[PDB]
């Protein structure tokens, strides 16, 4: 009688089947592209004979149930909750399931976990045969229905100008189940209007898209205006089902396959220095089997005032040779896929979601890994007593200052590049001797990899 | 703690087990179908009785190791080197160990010997019970290994 409507359907994500509370269930900001359903495998039996009387017969049997299909898209709207005062995306257990299979723990360091500054999602503890187990609850009008033991297969992140920032989720469940009784009241679990105002206070617009590309073999950072992009995280999950003739069967667990983090970035060709054309010609010139690039795509842009933004940080990526795409105005496409340091070392990449980004915050998130931990920005090597020169056979212990003063890693290395008339140790004691009449330089770079440069030309003379 | 991939294999052909230089060892550009290994022989000793309550037990003994098998494919790539200005194929010592059982001498007239015009291989001096003796060196990623005292069976 009463017809169920699509627009009135609300989704609930849970980690447990009983005792649903605010810490285990949430209302998901799903769009109007929802779709789900479970199909089955069937077998037909035909008979082929040669007698005078052919047997035109066909007998059908049900054999098994395929995986339950579910897919929906949500808005990327990071925010801070009033309870914890820490930036968390509304759909945080989805990112936890995509990241690692451990118990949900925002106070840890692996998987989806927040902080006072930003919400960061790493895949360092992803090396599992089975990720975190969810339960997609589908409340269409009044009738209940949920999908048993869902697991996130992939997360489709679309980054295109003229398009608002969104993410599309698609996964599979063991068995979709319809329910008659309410598992839990949706009103108090569902987000109230105040946190809806708090969430809508932060929107991410993909029109402001700035890319950080830097090769680790040459450190040639480029300036590329983005036309449109897309990067996805794939788990390659396959459900395993038994094969029994007598009765039908349902899937039993799964085994996550190979982790894939691929992305496609479209951008216009530029003749300007460090532009798209220079990147393309450098890549098509140095044809190398292996690539090692710093790619840091920043959705929503960067600003001095706190602004909502989404960040991808791929430390050691693999850039496929670009193919310049012909159109009205030449716009090329670059394909990348983040490879790890070691196949089982994790650290494929990590993401940043928060409404409160300053350029320094995103910078230290990119270089150090967290939006809260500070990193060095500039370095000037300091002589032991404002000294400008050195004579032959004289010791000089180099000192150094770093900025900001709140940097977590402040120690720097000591090296000599230009000139051969002195030496430096781990502590910085520069030493000279006889037959040292030439000008020499001294270098200093911190171990956090900010790209900081500490330089000073000391005029080492022959002495008195 | 690392996995080794076949794509990172590099093959060097040597005539000496020490004092490796550019005249005794060169890299051989191999392809995907490269393969190497060594199989082992064994034996099972089983008691074969006929009465009731017979003994049903076996026992294995390692008895011998087979000869190591290696194979790879290379492109025929003649060229002239800048040092000697004589046409030479990069895997020339393979051709020599295939052709003759004497010490390699590109200046000679038997086996693998080159010239200012072409690189030539003749089998006029292969009357030997043990042809020129090589040592295939295999480099997969980081770990090293080699096959001791190889002989070119065929090409």
Strand A260-268 to strand A226-234: parallel, antiparallel, or no bridges (unpaired)?
antiparallel
Residue of B nearest to A341 (CA): B2
Q: How many Cβ atoms are within 10 Å of A342's Cβ, its own excluded?
A: 11
What letter does residue A134 receive in the DSSP assignment? E
Long-range CB contact pairs, A340-347, < 8 A, 24+? A340/A316, A341/A315, A341/A316, A342/B1, A342/B2, A343/B3, A344/A127, A344/B1, A346/A122, A346/A123, A346/A124, A346/A125, A346/A126, A346/A127, A347/A122, A347/A123, A347/A124, A347/A315
Residues of A in contact with B2 (CB under 8 A): 342
For A69, phi then psi, to 5°, come to -105, 130
Q: CA B96 to CA B134: how far, in whole Å?
A: 10
Per the DSSP assignment, residues forming a β-bridge with A459 are A389
Q: Are strands A119-122 and A112-113 parallel, antiparallel or unpaired?
A: antiparallel
Enumerate chain B positions whose Cβ falls within 8 A of a Cβ in A.
1-3
Residues contacting residue A133 through CB under 8 Å, at least 6 positions apart: A15, A97, A149, A150, A151
Handedness of CA A429, A435, A441, A445 (dihedral sign): negative
| Contact predicate B32/B47, CB 8 Å | no
Instruction: Sort A382 into a burial class: Cβ within 10 Å, 0-12 / 13-18 / 19+.
Output: middle
Buried b (16+ CB within 10 A) or exposed e, A45-61: eeeeeeeeeeeeeeeee
Residue B135, classed as helix, strand or coil, is: strand
CA distance A35 to A58: 33
Which positions in chain B touch A341 (Cβ < 8 Å)? none
Report the C-alpha gap between B106 and B89 in whole angstroms. 12
Elucidation method: cryo-EM
- Closest alpha carbon within chain B to A344: B2
Torsion sign, CA atoms B71, B77, B79, B82: negative
Q: Mark yes or no for CB contact A343/B3 under 8 Å.
A: yes
CB-based contact A401:A382 (threshold 8 Å): yes
Could you give the CA distance from residue A88 to residue A119 in angstroms, rounded to a whole number? 6
Q: Which residues of chain B make contact with A342, given a CB cutoff of 8 A?
A: 1-2
In whole angstroms, give the CA distance from residue A354 to residue B117: 71
Q: Is A89 helix (H, G, I), strand (E, B) or coil?
A: coil
Instruction: Give chain A positions within 8 Å (CB) of B10.
Output: none
Residues 6+ apart with CB under 8 A from A124: A100, A109, A110, A111, A346, A347
Q: B22: distance to nearest CA of chain A, Å?
A: 26
Give A129: exposed, middle or buried? Use CB within 10 Å, 0-12, 13-18, 19+.
exposed
Q: Report chain B's terminal Cα–Cα distance, integer Å.
A: 37
The DSSP line for A199-237 is HHT---BTTS-EEEEEETTT---B--BEEEEEEEEE--E
Structure tokens at B96: 């020599």
Indicate the Cα dihedral angle A123, A27, A38, A101, nearest 10°.
20
Tokens of A104: 């949900």
Backbone angles phi, psi at A365, to 5 degrees: -65, -40
Kindly state the tokens that stand for A441: 């330089």
Alpha-helical regions (H) of A160-316 = 186-189, 193-200, 276-285
- CA dist A204 and A301 (Å) reads 9
How far is the C-alpha of A344 from the C-alpha of B112, rounded, in Å? 48
Tell me the two tokens of residue A70: 């579910």
- Nearest-Cα distance to chain B for A382, in Å, is 41
Q: Which residues of A touch B142 (CB under 8 A)?
A: none
Contacts of A344 in chain B (CB under 8 A): 1
Helix (H), strand (E) at residue A93? helix A92-99
From CA A384, how far away is CA A428, in angstroms rounded? 10
- Give the pair of three-digit tokens for residue A257: 């396959």
Q: Mapping DSSP to helix (H, G, I), strand (E, B) and coil, where does residue B93 land?
A: helix
CA-based nearest residue to A349, from A375, A374, A316: A316
Integer Cα distance of A283 and A264 in angstroms? 16
Q: Reported resolution in A? A: 3.5
Chain A closest-CA separation from residue B11 CA (Å): 19
Q: Which residues pair with B36 in a beta bridge?
A: B70
Phi, psi of B44 (to 5 degrees): -115, 125
CA distance readout (Å), B139 to A26, B10, B32: 55, 5, 14
Can you tell me which residue has the tokens 């007698």? A51
Print the SS3 string covering B57-92. Answer: CCCEEEEEECCCEEECCCCCCCEECCCCCCEECCCH
Count the Cβ atoms, other than its own, within 10 Å of residue A195.
15
Q: What angle do CA A338, A341, A344 make, to 5 degrees?
A: 95
H-helix segments, A267-404? 276-285, 359-368
DSSP state of A110: S
DSSP secondary-structure letter at A35? E
Phi, psi of A446 (to 5 degrees): -70, 160
CA-based nearest distance A115→chain B, Å:
33
Chain A positions with Cβ closer than 8 Å to B: 342-344
Residue A99: its H or E element: helix A92-99
Q: How far A368 CA sits from the closest chain B CA (Å)?
A: 25
Return the residue of B nearest to A342 by Cα: B2
Q: Which of B9, B13, B14, B51 is nearest to B30 (CA)?
A: B9
Burial classification of residue B146, based on how many CB atoms lie within 10 Å of its CB (0-12 exposed, 13-18 middle, 19 or more buried):
middle
Residues paired with A230 in a beta bridge: A158, A264
Query: Which residue is associated with the tokens 């990899």?
Result: A449
Answer for the pair A357, A309: CB distance below 8 angstroms, yes or no.
yes
DSSP B98: H
Nearest CA in chain A to B4: A343
Q: Give the integer Cα–Cα distance in Å for B145 and B148.
A: 10
| Number of Cα atoms under 13 Å in the Cβ half of residue A264 | 11
Q: Taking a C-beta distance cutoff of 8 angstroms, is the pair A422, A431 a contact?
A: yes
3-state secondary structure of A264: strand
Which has the closest alpha carbon to A293: A350, A347, A355, A336? A336
User: Angle at the Cα of A140 (from A94 to A93), degrees rounded to 5?
Assistant: 10
Q: Which helix H or strand E contains A40, and what residues bound it? A: strand A40-46
Q: A with B: how many residue pairs have Cβ under 8 Å apart?
A: 4
- Nearest chain A Cα distance for residue B143, angstroms: 16
Contact partners, residue A252, CB within 8 Å, separation at least 6: A174, A239, A240, A241, A242
- Count other Cβ atoms within 10 Å, centred on residue A13: 20
Chain A positions touching B1 (Cβ under 8 A) are 342, 344
Distance CA B49, CA B112 (A): 62
| Polymer length in residues for chain B | 155
Question: CA B114, B116, B117, B118: dihedral to nearest 10 degrees?
Answer: 20
Which residues are CB-neighbours of A326 under 8 A, at least 6 positions away? none
Contacts of A343 in chain B (CB under 8 A): 3
Q: How many residues does chain A have?
A: 464
Rounded Cα distance between B104 and B135, Å, is 14
Distance from CA of B127 to the nearest CA of A (A): 45
Instruction: Name the 3-class secondary structure at A198.
Output: helix
Q: In terms of CA atoms, which chain A residue is nearest residue B3?
A: A343
In terms of CA atoms, which chain A residue is nearest residue B8?
Answer: A289
Radius of gyration of the CA atoms of chain B, in A: 22
* 3 state SS of A378: strand
- Rounded to 5 degrees, what are φ and ψ at A297? -80, 130
Q: How far is CA B64 from CA B41, B42, B67, in A?
A: 5, 7, 10
Minimum distance, in Å, between the CA of residue B21 and any CA atom of chain A: 28
B144 vs chain A: nearest CA distance in angstroms?
20
| φ, ψ dihedrals at A150, nearest 5° | -70, 150
> In DSSP terms, which residues pair with A178 in a beta bridge?
A145
Alpha carbon distance A113, A104 (integer Å): 8
Whether residues A343 and B1 touch (CB distance < 8 A) is answered with no
Yes or no: say if A173 and A149 are a contact pair by the CB < 8 Å rule: yes
Cβ A331 vs Cβ A227: under 8 Å: yes
In angstroms, the CA B153 to CA A234 distance is 48
Which chain A positions have a beta carbon within 8 Å of B6's beta carbon?
none
Q: How far is CA A176 from the centre of its chain?
A: 30
With contacts defined as CB-CB under 8 Å, which chain A residues touch B3? Answer: 343
Q: Within 13 Å and on the Cβ side, how many CA atoms surround A281? A: 10
Q: To probe the interface with A, which of B2, B7, B9, B141 has the most A CB atoms within 10 Å?
A: B2
A365 - beta bridge partners? none
Contact between A416 and A441 under an 8 Å Cβ cutoff? The reply is: yes
Rounded CA-CA distance A176/A450 in Å is 49
């Amino acid at each position: 009688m009463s017809l169920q409507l699509l627009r009135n359907t609300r989704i609930f994500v849970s980690t447990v089947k009983t005792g649903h509370n605010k810490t285990n269930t949430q209302e998901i900001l799903v769009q109007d592209d929802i779709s789900w359903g479970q199909d089955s495998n069937s077998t037909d039996i035909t008979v082929n004979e040669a007698g005078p009387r052919p047997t035109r017969g066909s007998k059908r049997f049900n054999d098994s149930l395929n995986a339950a299909e579910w897919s929906f898209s949500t808005y990327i709207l990071p925010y801070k909750d009033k309870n914890t005062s820490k930036q968390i995306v509304p759909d945080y257990m989805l990112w936890h399931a995509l990241s690692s299979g451990r118990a949900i723990n925002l106070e840890g360091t692996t998987g989806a976990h927040n902080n006072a500054t930003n919400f960061m999602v790493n895949f360092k503890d992803n090396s599992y045969h089975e990720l975190a187990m969810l339960h997609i609850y589908i409340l269409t009008d009044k009738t209940w229905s949920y999908i048993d033991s869902c697991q996130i297969n992939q997360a489709e992140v679309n980054v295109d100008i003229e398009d608002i920032g969104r993410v599309t989720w698609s996964g599979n469940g063991n068995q979709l189940i319809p329910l008659d009784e309410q598992p839990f009241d949706p009103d108090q679990i569902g987000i109230d209007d105040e946190t809806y105002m708090t969430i809508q206070g932060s929107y991410i617009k993909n029109k402001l898209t700035i890319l950080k590309i830097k090769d680790m073999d040459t450190n040639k950072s480029y300036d590329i205006p983005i036309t449109g992009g897309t990067f996805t995280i794939n788990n390659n999950i396959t459900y395993l089902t038994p094969n029994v003739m007598s009765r039908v069967t349902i899937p039993i667990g799964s085994f996550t396959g190979a982790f894939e983090l691929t992305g496609s970035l479209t951008a216009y060709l530029n003749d300007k220095s460090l532009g798209s054309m220079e990147l393309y010609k450098d890549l098509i010139k140095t044809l190398k089997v292996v690539n090692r690039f710093e790619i840091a795509l920043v959705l929503g842009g960067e600003y001095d005032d706190e602004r909502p933004a989404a960040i991808l940080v791929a430390k050691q990526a693999h850039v496929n040779i670009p193919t310049i795409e012909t159109d009205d105005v030449l716009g090329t496409s670059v394909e990348f896929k983040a490879i790890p340091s070691d196949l089982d070392a994790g650290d494929e990449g990590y993401l940043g979601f928060s409404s409160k980004y300053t350029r320094t915050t995103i910078n230290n998130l990119i270089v150090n890994g967290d939006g809260a931990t500070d990193a060095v920005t500039a370095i000037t090597v300091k002589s032991a007593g404002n000294v400008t020169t050195l004579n032959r056979s004289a010791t000089l212990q180099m000192s150094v200052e770093v900025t900001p003063s709140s940097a977590r890693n402040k120690e720097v290395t000591w090296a000599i590049t230009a000139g051969d008339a002195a030496t430096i140790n781990a502590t910085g004691l520069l030493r000279a001797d006889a037959s040292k009449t030439g000008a020499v330089t001294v270098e200093a770079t911190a171990k956090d990899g900010s790209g900081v440069k500490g330089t000073k030309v000391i005029t080492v003379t022959a002495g008195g």
